[PDB]
Design a binder for this molecule. Structure first.
Ligand SMILES: O=c1ccn([C@H]2C[C@H](O)[C@@H](COP(=O)(O)NP(=O)(O)OP(=O)(O)O)O2)c(=O)[nH]1
Ligand SMILES: O=c1ccn([C@H]2C[C@H](O)[C@@H](COP(=O)(O)NP(=O)(O)OP(=O)(O)O)O2)c(=O)[nH]1
Ligand SMILES: O=c1ccn([C@H]2C[C@H](O)[C@@H](COP(=O)(O)NP(=O)(O)OP(=O)(O)O)O2)c(=O)[nH]1
Ligand SMILES: [Mg+2]
Ligand SMILES: [Mg+2]
Ligand SMILES: [Mg+2]
Lengths: 144, 144, 144
């Protein structure tokens, strides 16, 4: 009945430890139930003239579980409306990283600068399993 | 023997409900067996001068299963040949979305405009599981 | 005790067959334990003036398992420092592909050209499961 009970269908759902390096920002959350991503905030004010990029602090650190990856995606609304993107998209956040998550925002508009404010939602963070593959070198795919 | 039988190795393979909002376009399909993506069509004719972007209608809506994500990726051929990309790539399609899938195409060529026609394959849609992570705020990764 | 023993927690970890088409380059490896990606090398020297793109040979071919996808992501360091990106990111490598992996590098800097050398780490390759979804066409999401 209350939300502290893990419902049967979410028994196996994983936890992500997070430190709010900038406690002034809300915890990242999912916009709606079942949303793939939790939105990351900007800790900072930044203006991007057309074509410029910035490495923007999000004020969070996370501990992606071993066997998993964090993935930093552009929001579609800002992408379409003003041409905001992420140079290294999808940003790859490794299980072992304990640093601050940073977003390499870029202005892909021709002519209009983008102003981002501290407390704006600038990206989305997903968490997926990844295959930590063992390479097997072969001389031909025949043999494999 | 016939294709209506789910082969043992595909017993668990998931279904994706789709509505062809624009019934004039073929259903998205995989180019070859085991292909990660089904190709999305453009419902529309659009010309992108260098550096410009457009939000292009695909004529489909989908129901990504709960626990899953739809992911909209650029095709590599158009990317290399004419510099076509997707501003918000990888496009994030949430389980709860029942709208039309739209592709934010962008011309990354310097000098040559891209012409897209209705019925062109402009992107690829993948479907993956996602971890709907429960955030656990900690003051340090020690504690976690 | 020795590394030839598959530790219990990695019993199920998957193998990826690889051919070094250019045996002069090291095998792709993970920068640290639990890293999502193995770094791909450039087989070639290439200079990208601002805004230009190139399809760069990596000197490898791989056999992504059936049920899986290879994903080619930008490195964040080069993305931020010099504006290097990948036009079709995330590059989609299909299970059935046995060709050379190629990286569609692009210079997103305004003004400074990027020089890549043979033996530079230019991208990262991830491997994930993918849902080879069966489309089910419906006239409305009601019915589904
Ligand atoms: O390439 C895309 C990406 C998203 N979408 C749709 C589906 C997705 O569930 C919805 C929201 O995507 P984002 O969360 O990336 N956009 P934004 O964060 O700007 O809007 P919202 O506040 O709706 O989450 O937009 C597309 O049609 N095409
Ligand atoms: O970054 C990439 C992406 C793809 N590829 C190769 C492997 C992949 O299986 C193949 C096809 O990729 P796309 O489906 O993204 N390209 P496209 O749709 O233009 O061609 P096709 O008609 O072959 O699917 O191209 C690369 O070598 N590097
Ligand atoms: O969008 C990003 C991407 C990465 N990162 C951090 C987390 C990740 O684990 C770390 C390394 O990312 P890359 O491997 O993509 N960068 P690079 O290969 O340049 O550096 P390294 O040599 O550290 O792997 O950088 C971010 O903070 N934001
Ligand atoms: Mg959103
Ligand atoms: Mg294709
Ligand atoms: Mg790296």
């Amino acid at each position: 009945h209350s939300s502290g009970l893990v419902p049967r269908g979410s028994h196996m759902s994983t936890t992500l430890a997070i430190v709010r390096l900038d406690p002034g920002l809300p915890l990242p959350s999912r916009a709606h139930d079942g949303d793939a991503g939790v939105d990351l905030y900007s800790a900072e004010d930044v203006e991007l003239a057309p074509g410029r990029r910035a490495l923007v602090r999000t004020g969070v650190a996370v501990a992606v579980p071993f066997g998993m990856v964090g993935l930093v995606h552009p929001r579609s609304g800002l992408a379409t409306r003003v041409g905001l993107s992420i140079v290294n998209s999808p940003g790859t956040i490794d299980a072992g990283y304990r640093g601050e998550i940073k977003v390499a925002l870029i202005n892909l508009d021709p002519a209009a600068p983008i102003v981002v404010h501290r407390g704006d939602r600038i990206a989305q963070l997903l968490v997926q399993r990844v295959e930590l593959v063992e390479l097997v070198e072969v001389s031909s795919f025949d043999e494999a």
